[PDB]
Structure 1
Amino acid sequence: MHLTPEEKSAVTALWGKVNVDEVGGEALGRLLVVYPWTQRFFESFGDLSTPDAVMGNPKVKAHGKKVLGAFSDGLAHLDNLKGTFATLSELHADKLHVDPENFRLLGKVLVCVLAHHFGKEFTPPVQAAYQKVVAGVANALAHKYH
């Protein structure tokens, strides 16, 4: 995907400060709290009954770390999101059967978490750049669904 120079710079500069483990646990956990129907994929994760249980759930933390780790790897290949995510796209479509709309919900929550964590530094132009990136990653993950 193509971004302006200023947009790419905005995205990579901020991501250098992101501790993927911490933000990853937080983004997945909020997804499960704010849009609880997304819990349908994580029945084996344990207690997800309340916000505090979700946020302290070590399996939630570890999965978020895994998910955003892969996302992170995607940012290093902004020029070819489809090719980078094709295998994981197949995985999600054919084995996990995850409705790609979940990728978009996760995108929305992720933007909220970056704003929460970084505050004033997450300016309107930086958000716009990230919105393009999370949309492009969701589209890349949805590509192999047939």
Structure 2
Amino acid sequence: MHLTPEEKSAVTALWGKVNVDEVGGEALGRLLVVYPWTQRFFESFGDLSTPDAVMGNPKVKAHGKKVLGAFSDGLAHLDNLKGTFATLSELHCDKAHVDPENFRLLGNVLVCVLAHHFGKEFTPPVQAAYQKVVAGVANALAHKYH
């Protein structure tokens, strides 16, 4: 996590405009749609057969909001992601058995979601800041795997 002061202000300024509820549902739904293998964790979510069925699924929306919720908090402790994400890292490993590669896929989807939403405001340099952040978070979420 080599976030220069200016990379950090940039992450923070944009994050101010985000509707985490909405972004969370979009990012998770889009993950399940672009990389359908990731659907392996949600067979209790019901119908994920088509894009509309995934995107509109009340369960996907609710889980996305949760995920992005934890992510936003992560954004207030950029200094200590590993600490911030420790119990969550354990849970994904030990209880949910989620391959950490899943965390990188979602980060990329999230980056595309932010670009989708902010248009021209998501400049090359802002993307570069967010690239470091999603990677920092995936790394923190994978730190307790064994």
| TM tier, smaller | over 0.9
Deviation at 1:5, TM superposition (A): 1.1
4+ residue runs over 4 A deviation: none
- Of 2-11 and 86-95, deviating more is 2-11
In the alignment, structure 1 segments of 5+ residues that lack a partner are none
- Answer whether contact 2:2 2:132 (CA < 8 A) is retained: no
Q: Deviations over 1:100-122 (max 9, x none)?
A: 00000000000000000010000
User: Shift of residue 2 of structure 1?
Assistant: 3.8
Q: Percent identity?
A: 98
Do the aligned partners of 1:107 and 1:134 also contact (CA within 8 Å) in 2?
yes
Give the corresponding residue for 1:20: 20
2:143 aligns with 143
* Gaps in structure 2 of 5+ consecutive residues: none
TM-score (norm: length of structure 2) = 0.99
Question: Contact 1:2 / 1:79 at 8 angstroms: preserved in 2?
Answer: no
Residues 13-52 of structure 1 aligned to structure 2 (within 5 Å)? 13-52=13-52
Q: Tell me how many residue pairs correspond in the alignment.
A: 146
Q: CA deviation at 1:144?
A: 0.3
Larger helix proportion of the pair:
1
Query: What does the per-residue CA deviation read over 1:26-51, in whole Å, with 9 as the maximum and x for residues that have no partner?
Result: 00000000000000000000100000
Distance 1:32 1:86 in 2: 25
